[PDB]
Amino acid sequence: SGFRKMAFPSGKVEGCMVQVTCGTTTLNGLWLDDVVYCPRHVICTSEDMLNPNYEDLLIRKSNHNFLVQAGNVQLRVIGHSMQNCVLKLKVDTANPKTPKYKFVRIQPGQTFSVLACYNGSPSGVYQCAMRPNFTIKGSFLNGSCGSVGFNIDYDCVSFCYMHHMELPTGVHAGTDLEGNFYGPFVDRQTAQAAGTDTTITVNVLAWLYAAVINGDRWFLNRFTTTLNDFNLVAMKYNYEPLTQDHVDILGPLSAQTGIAVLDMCASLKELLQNGMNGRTILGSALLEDEFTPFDVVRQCS
Amino acid sequence: SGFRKMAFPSGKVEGCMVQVTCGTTTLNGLWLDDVVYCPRHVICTSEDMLNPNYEDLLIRKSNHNFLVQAGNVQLRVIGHSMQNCVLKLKVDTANPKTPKYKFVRIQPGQTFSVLACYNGSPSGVYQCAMRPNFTIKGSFLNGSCGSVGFNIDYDCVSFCYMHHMELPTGVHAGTDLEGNFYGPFVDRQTAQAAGTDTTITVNVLAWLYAAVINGDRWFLNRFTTTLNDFNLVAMKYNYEPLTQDHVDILGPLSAQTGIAVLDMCASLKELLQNGMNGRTILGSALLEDEFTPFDVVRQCSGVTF
Numbered sequence: 001s002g003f004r005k006m007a008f009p010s011g012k013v014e015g016c017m018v019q020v021t022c023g024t025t026t027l028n029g030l031w032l033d034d035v036v037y038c039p040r041h042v043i044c045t046s047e048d049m050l051n052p053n054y055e056d057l058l059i060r061k062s063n064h065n066f067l068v069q070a071g072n073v074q075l076r077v078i079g080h081s082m083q084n085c086v087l088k089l090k091v092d093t094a095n096p097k098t099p100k101y102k103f104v105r106i107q108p109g110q111t112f113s114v115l116a117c118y119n120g121s122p123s124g125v126y127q128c129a130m131r132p133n134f135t136i137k138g139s140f141l142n143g144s145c146g147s148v149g150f151n152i153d154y155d156c157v158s159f160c161y162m163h164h165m166e167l168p169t170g171v172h173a174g175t176d177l178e179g180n181f182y183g184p185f186v187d188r189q190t191a192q193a194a195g196t197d198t199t200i201t202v203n204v205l206a207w208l209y210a211a212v213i214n215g216d217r218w219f220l221n222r223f224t225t226t227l228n229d230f231n232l233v234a235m236k237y238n239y240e241p242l243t244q245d246h247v248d249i250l251g252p253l254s255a256q257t258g259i260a261v262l263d264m265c266a267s268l269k270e271l272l273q274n275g276m277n278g279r280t281i282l283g284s285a286l287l288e289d290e291f292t293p294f295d296v297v298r299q300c301s
Numbered sequence: 302s303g304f305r306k307m308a309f310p311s312g313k314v315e316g317c318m319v320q321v322t323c324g325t326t327t328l329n330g331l332w333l334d335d336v337v338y339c340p341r342h343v344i345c346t347s348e349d350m351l352n353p354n355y356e357d358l359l360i361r362k363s364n365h366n367f368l369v370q371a372g373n374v375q376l377r378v379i380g381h382s383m384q385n386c387v388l389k390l391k392v393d394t395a396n397p398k399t400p401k402y403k404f405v406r407i408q409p410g411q412t413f414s415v416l417a418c419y420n421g422s423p424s425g426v427y428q429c430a431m432r433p434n435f436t437i438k439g440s441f442l443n444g445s446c447g448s449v450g451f452n453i454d455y456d457c458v459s460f461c462y463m464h465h466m467e468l469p470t471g472v473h474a475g476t477d478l479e480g481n482f483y484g485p486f487v488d489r490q491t492a493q494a495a496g497t498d499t500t501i502t503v504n505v506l507a508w509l510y511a512a513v514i515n516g517d518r519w520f521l522n523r524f525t526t527t528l529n530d531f532n533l534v535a536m537k538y539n540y541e542p543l544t545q546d547h548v549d550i551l552g553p554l555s556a557q558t559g560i561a562v563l564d565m566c567a568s569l570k571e572l573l574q575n576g577m578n579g580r581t582i583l584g585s586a587l588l589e590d591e592f593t594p595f596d597v598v599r600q601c602s603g604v605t606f
């Protein structure tokens with residue numbers, strides 16, 4: 001019993017964190033096999049932040065301009081290349097702690113663990129989700145760039161995020177491990193803003209199923225709803241549309257609790273209309289949307 | 302920016318998790334140097350748990366009855382002893398991944414990271430607080446026993462908790478690494494209940510300071526209060542008493558934000574008597590009490606391990 005926001009154990013990623021220094025800039029790198037991945041903005045100066053020409057800046061760099069430190073050991077850079085917004089520094093040593101890994105690009109609503117790092121040293125691990133507006137609500141200070149987001153499948157680390165920047169509202173933007181930004185963001189200091197964020201409806205429903213599995217039933221009602229009527233209501237509360245894919249995804253939790261998805265949707269509509277009235281669900285006074293249907297099943301069963 | 306419930310990096314503890322099997326029971330063990338620590342209830346059967354005489358049950362066990370597995374490698378048990386509610390299995394191999402460590406007993410209100418394990422394999426890490434009623438609001442399924450709670454100070458792991466059981470309300474009970482239970486709990490299948498819990502006041506204040514550091518100031522007011530008047534109001538809402546020690550520990554956050562501790566106490570008093578009024582603090586509609594003043598400073602300044 002109990003339901004917590006739970007991150008994956010970070011050990012497999014900790015053994016991959018290194019410090020990358022280029023001139024006066026120091027950030028984090030991910031050392032896998034003989035390659036160190038890091039945000040390409042590490043090559044930028046104060047004059048190259050508004051409109052950097054990364055191809056032009058990178059061509060002017062030599063391998064010895066990149067200082068890579070793994071623990072108290074300096075790694076030797078023997079090559080450098082850019083893949084989208086990620087810099088790939090070929091090093092002369094394969095990381096002996098390289099876990100079984102994959103690079104995966106995730107979709108909004110997906111969750112992942114973040115290992116926040118400074119100077120190539122892990123500071124903390126937390127859980128978050130890719131917001132529908134493609135930002136993440138992280139906890140990151142200056143120097144956290146290059147910190148990664150991941151999930152673990154048995155003994156395989158799926159890297160899904162690398163931190164690049166903080167937007168004016170305090171939310172965070174980054175890329176997958178192929179350097180493709182999530183969202184319409186660019187690695188420039190040009191005015192950028194996160195779009196209006198919405199609540200991840202399928203995740204709220206999964207969390208209501210987690211509450212039922214944990215014995216919390218006060219919010220259930222005798223009603224059901226059509227999928228279209230639910231979306232019409234949910235949209236008015238800035239909730240993401242619930243698709244038939246989402247309804248299908250919730251099938252196993254629906255079977256386990258005996259509450260049809262559209263029956264749970266009617267409970268969610270009622271919660272949106274009434275609020276909680278001094279009550280809580282799984283220790284929260286707000287509807288939680290950073291647990292996926294997969295997270296709920298994993299944590300409960 | 303941002304404020305998250307953040308656990309310590311779990312790597313140093315992951316390299317210590319092993320699976321301990323005794324008869325039909327399988328749970329987790331903590332392998333440090335040449336000793337595997339685990340809950341002594343691993344030696345119990347269904348009948349035993351009802352009224353166990355652990356000295357009597359343990360004397361009947363031989364070293365070969367305990368199957369210890371570290372990864373896909375079986376460790377050899379060469380001795381066994383009991384220290385309070387923890388079983389200590391001496392093994393022939395010292396854990397090469399043993400970090401710098403200490404065993405520490407924490408106080409209620411102190412937070413720690415839990416590495417939840419099943420079959421000696423880490424499944425997740427979460428941060429929690431030792432409740433004033435000595436339970437933890439954890440997330441554990443059957444097989445999680447032996448999972449540990451820890452903090453990190455520089456490169457030293459301080460082990461503070463080992464999971465033993467789940468109470469009828471779904472909250473959790475366990476011991477320090479010396480086998481002493483936190484709270485009035487015993488390791489037996491008998492009627493036990495968590496006492497009425499209270500809110501960790503010093504932690505709520507620390508979290509209000511974290512909200513201010515992050516730009517959330519709506520709850521601040523022009524008022525201050527005496528420590529005694531605040532404690533009188535705190536008693537009413539089932540909040541823990543705020544001591545002068547707590548006021549002192551909040552000193553650095555008070556200096557950083559420019560809000561005296563008793564000034565923040567007057568904000569907390571108003572939040573208690575009047576509520577949030579539809580507003581949230583750090584994305585929460587409830588006052589969060591599972592961040593200590595040290596956690597807030599560590600997160601808002603970026604301390605690394």
Ligand SMILES: CN(C)CC(=O)NC[C@@]1(C(=O)Nc2cncc3ccccc23)CCOc2ccc(Cl)cc21
Nearest residue numbers: 041044045046140141142164165166187188189302
């Ligand atoms: C040193 N400087 C030349 C480069 C640099 O490190 N820039 C990093 C920077 C950025 O967003 N950094 C940060 C990241 N996460 C959390 C933060 C919390 C507080 C302050 C900064 C934070 C700052 C300037 O705005 C941009 C704009 C585009 C991009 Cl991709 C990055 C950035």
Ligand SMILES: CN(C)CC(=O)NC[C@@]1(C(=O)Nc2cncc3ccccc23)CCOc2ccc(Cl)cc21
Nearest residue numbers: 001342345346347441442443465466467488489490
């Ligand atoms: C029965 N026994 C030989 C094996 C066993 O399962 N013992 C463990 C047990 C216990 O509390 N287990 C659990 C721990 N954490 C989370 C759980 C979630 C769901 C179900 C069980 C959970 C079972 C119940 O009763 C007691 C009572 C005293 C103590 Cl110290 C332990 C136990």
